Amino acid sequence: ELFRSEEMTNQTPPTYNKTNKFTHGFQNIVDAYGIGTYREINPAPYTVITFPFLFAVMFGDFGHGILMTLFAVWMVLRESRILSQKNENEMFSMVFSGRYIILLMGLFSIYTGLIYNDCFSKSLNIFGSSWSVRPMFTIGNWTEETLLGSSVLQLNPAIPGVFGGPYPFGIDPIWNIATNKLTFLNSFKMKMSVILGIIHMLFGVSLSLFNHIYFKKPLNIYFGFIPEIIFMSSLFGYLVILIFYKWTAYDAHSSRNAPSLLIHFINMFLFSYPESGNAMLYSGQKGIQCFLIVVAMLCVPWMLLFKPLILRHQYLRKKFDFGDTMVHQAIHTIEYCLGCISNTASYLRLWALSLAHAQLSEVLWTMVIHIGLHVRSLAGGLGLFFIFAAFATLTVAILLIMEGLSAFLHALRLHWVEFQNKFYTGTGFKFLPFSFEHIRE
Amino acid sequence: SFFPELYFNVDNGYLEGLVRGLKAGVLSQADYLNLVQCETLEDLKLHLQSTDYGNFLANEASPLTVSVIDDKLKEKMVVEFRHMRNHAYEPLASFLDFITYSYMIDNVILLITGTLHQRSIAELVPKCHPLGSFEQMEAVNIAQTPAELYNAILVDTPLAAFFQDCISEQDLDEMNIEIIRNTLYKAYLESFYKFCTLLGGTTADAMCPILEFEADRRAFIITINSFGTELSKEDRAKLFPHCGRLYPEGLAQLARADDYEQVKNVADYYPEYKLLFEGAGSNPGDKTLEDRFFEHEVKLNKLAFLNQFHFGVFYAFVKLKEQECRNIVWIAECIAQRHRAKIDNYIPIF
């Protein structure tokens, strides 16, 4: 059961979407892109959660997530005073109208920040950090290493026989103070963004099946949905499976010359299958790699030209610009196939913005508040006062406002372009009933 | 060359989209037909309101007249022009200034003559064509002193460079007013053409053909109309612009010509013009030469919109709408005067 527009009273009706005090804002950001086709699947019920989630990934900051909610709460607490007043300031009105959107966005931002364990670059210690056993580090032929340590860092080895075990929840806090967090955690977020982006696209495509059923267009799935989803699954879902496989299949025991999923993915597409010199993820992978790419090609004829071909077949038997229809379908096929590749890149914004934010938080902390601390008691305390006040100011000016606004826009971009374009198609008319709008006049 | 199609849209991108979007709204042949199928001015309004034109006769006198339709149409395109002229930067604005110059030239002819025959500036300004404007003073409150108007023009009015041909005031009093205005127009056209050639990209190739046509048009029409008047052949030649196809050789024959046939014989050497004189049947119930010139000029102004990276679209834009205004008024006049058989004397603008 999906939400669809209401019937209006054999002409194309306007699109009527019932909204309430909370969901109205979400419908508007959908309508800002366009008015949906009559009886189209309304994306808004999914936006209510999907968009805050994409923001929370882009804005995965536990500390700012709280501040963000508090801002929204302030507006809600004055809800009765703001509504029953004059509001000539349109920017205030807009954020007020979106106050329930902002609150939710903060709610998920806290969730994601908590798992990332970053609250103004602060980790969340649950007493579960057991990544390594330092006492055993020194036993492993490291005697008085802290003397040389004065000029070195020294990276903690994997599988020394004494380390291991995951952090109970989220990323082990120890990475928050590491010099190589920029490879361990950056890689994870890279893979996460790809996985989430692909899933989101597949969801949007799955919704197209329901739309194809509602309008009784069997052909739109026989040569559309089916070969399109086959293309995407065989290439993009396979990649996702490999990512999880790598995490679960190989340990540090093979870290040297460990298989690289990027290279295998490229070699997959190119049918490059070296006999030796590069370790494979699993035996027979080359056969699977070749199989999937060939099948992806085999589905293309359906999506590329068979739709106008069968329409010509059925048309002439029942009796349509065949050439023009070929042009339309060929362009559509290119957009879908090429767009999936491009769209995957689009969802790298989740990584790019999450990283960019993390860089702002780490640098803003380190180069502002950290320097305000000093071994001298009174000077340190008083310095923290003035430095913190400026620090909090910068956190608001840079992250809570500007970056929160950027992540808002970028997550909204993903909704409009990559998600909606899989099922939310066509246009409708504005629903404008008679109403007693002139209440104040 | 690689000069255009690159920096053009950096500043002029908005105006190019806007002006072509405005052109998209010009009356089509289908729309002119709906305007013809009226026979009533009130119905003419109602049918015109079907397009981007309309809603400009509202709140005016209940009786609908031609003078109102004429003034309102002019006002519409002036406002649109001023809008684009104000939202523009020197690289393009200077081009637009030349367009306004053509109207300023006519207006300063009005400022003189009246000044020469004791008329106050305040009385003359209301009859000046828009875009002349003359926001500068000293040209205002000249105290009906020709010297003060002449000095104010040299100093404040951008047309001062053009008046270098007509100088010292002596010229203003001794020259026939029409020779002065034709002389100033020549100076304008010569400078404007050179300006277009200094912008030696798409604009030069898209714009000059129209200016070259106008130059040759002036030579042909002036020569013919000059036959019945008192004017030395040499002084007539002095008014022929040099930015055209007749300048290399041809003007010499028009300057000597004393007959329509001799002028046509010159056109015979230029197929682009020969066809116009052949089309200008000039019968007692047919089209004439001026009509064929308008048809050709519009064809060129429409072809101007085949280039997406130049300034000539704005020149054609103004001139094309000016003819459209002539067309609309013509219909209103045909209704007002009840001459339905003469309705098909408008110049289609495609």
Partner: protein
């Protein structure tokens, strides 16, 4: 000895400074007085 150092320094230092003068002279040479106010009458 160290020719490459004095050479590199003097060449690029004098070249940049010489150009700064050349451009400044150009900009001064072509100062626009406005060609108005009284110029139109003298012209």
């Amino acid at each position: 000895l160290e020719y490459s150092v004095v050479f590199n320094l003097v060449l690029w230092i004098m070249t940049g400074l010489a150009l700064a003068v050349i451009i400044t002279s150009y900009n001064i040479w072509n100062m626009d007085p406005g060609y108005d106010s009284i110029i139109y009458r003298m012209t």
